[PDB]
Amino acid sequence: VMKLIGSHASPYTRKVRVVLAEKKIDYQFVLEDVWNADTQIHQFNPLGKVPCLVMDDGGALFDSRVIAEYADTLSPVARLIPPSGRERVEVRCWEALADGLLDAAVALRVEQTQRTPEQRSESWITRQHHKIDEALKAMSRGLADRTWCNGNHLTLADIAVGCALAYLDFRQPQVDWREQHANLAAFYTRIEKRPSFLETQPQAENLYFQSH
């Protein structure tokens, strides 16, 4: 059984976990804190980042885009990445847009946890918030009046966007993306109820589902 190294908070890890659930691929979720000085992540991912997927023979796969792509090939349940042409490139670009929103939001989390108050840069903070604001505008423009980001069914584009919006709710709740973008609010209401999203909420890090 493959092992996915990650954390409950990590939105790149969540993207992979959602893909694995949609694809009905069995895996073992292995919790790791990459920010701990005693982390073992570099024994598996040379970049020291999560998610990292480890196979039965010890082979390791990264990053989240590579893992998600690989996972779509492992099962016939759903087709999360179109095989070719225009729809595929669109789905890949949507994933990059969502991942870039995540890159900016995660940069903000790093500015909080990895810098002392005296080291923090207001210009860097502004820059990342500008990226989030503009990424949200593009997501709203791209989705328009449609049910899904691309074509007529859930793809990796929707999964990625869903994880990004959820990550804003979790770490950046002051960004009122729902008020700014009605179509994203509606989109998220539709995607958040999927079992794959319900089972992978970052808020599950607080151990709530271990209570009797």
Ligand X SMILES: N[C@@H](CCC(=O)N[C@@H](CS)C(=O)NCC(=O)O)C(=O)O
Interacting residues with its own copies (CB under 8 A): 42, 46-49, 61-63, 65-66, 69-70, 73, 84-85, 89, 92-93, 95-97, 99-101, 103-104, 114-116, 118-121, 123-124, 127, 130-131, 134-135, 137-138
- Cβ atoms within 10 A of the Cβ of 115, count? 12
Phi-psi region of 207 (alpha: psi -120 to 50; beta: other; left: phi over 0): left
Q: Report the nearest approach of ligand X to the CB of residue 146 (Å).
A: 25
- Give the residues across from 6 on adjacent strands: 31
Helical H runs in the chain? Answer: 11-22, 64-73, 85-113, 122-143, 156-171, 177-180, 182-192, 195-198
Q: Which does residue 114 touch among ligand X, its own copies, none (CB within 5 to 8 A, set by kind)?
A: its own copies
Closest CB to ligand X: residue number = 64
Q: Report the nearest approach of its own copies to the CB of residue 130 (Å).
A: 7
Q: Report the nearest approach of its own copies to the CB of residue 123 (Å).
A: 7
Q: Report the nearest approach of ligand X to the CB of residue 50 (Å).
A: 4
Provide the 3-class DSSP secondary structure of residue 17.
Answer: helix
Q: Which does residue 176 touch among ligand X, its own copies, none (CB within 5 to 8 A, set by kind)?
A: none
Q: Report the nearest approach of ligand X to the CB of residue 186 (Å).
A: 27
| Binding-site residues from annotation | 49-50, 64, 127, 131
Binding mask 102-141 for ligand X (x = CB under 6 A): ----x--------------------x--------------
Q: Which of residues 10-49 bind ligand X (CB under 6 A)?
A: 10, 12, 34, 48-49
Distance of CA 23 to CAs 16, 53, 156, 196, Å? 10, 15, 11, 10
Distance of CA 101 to CAs 23, 165, 166, 201, Å? 25, 9, 11, 18
Applying CB under 6 A, the residues found at the interface with ligand X are 10, 12, 34, 48-51, 63-65, 99, 106, 127
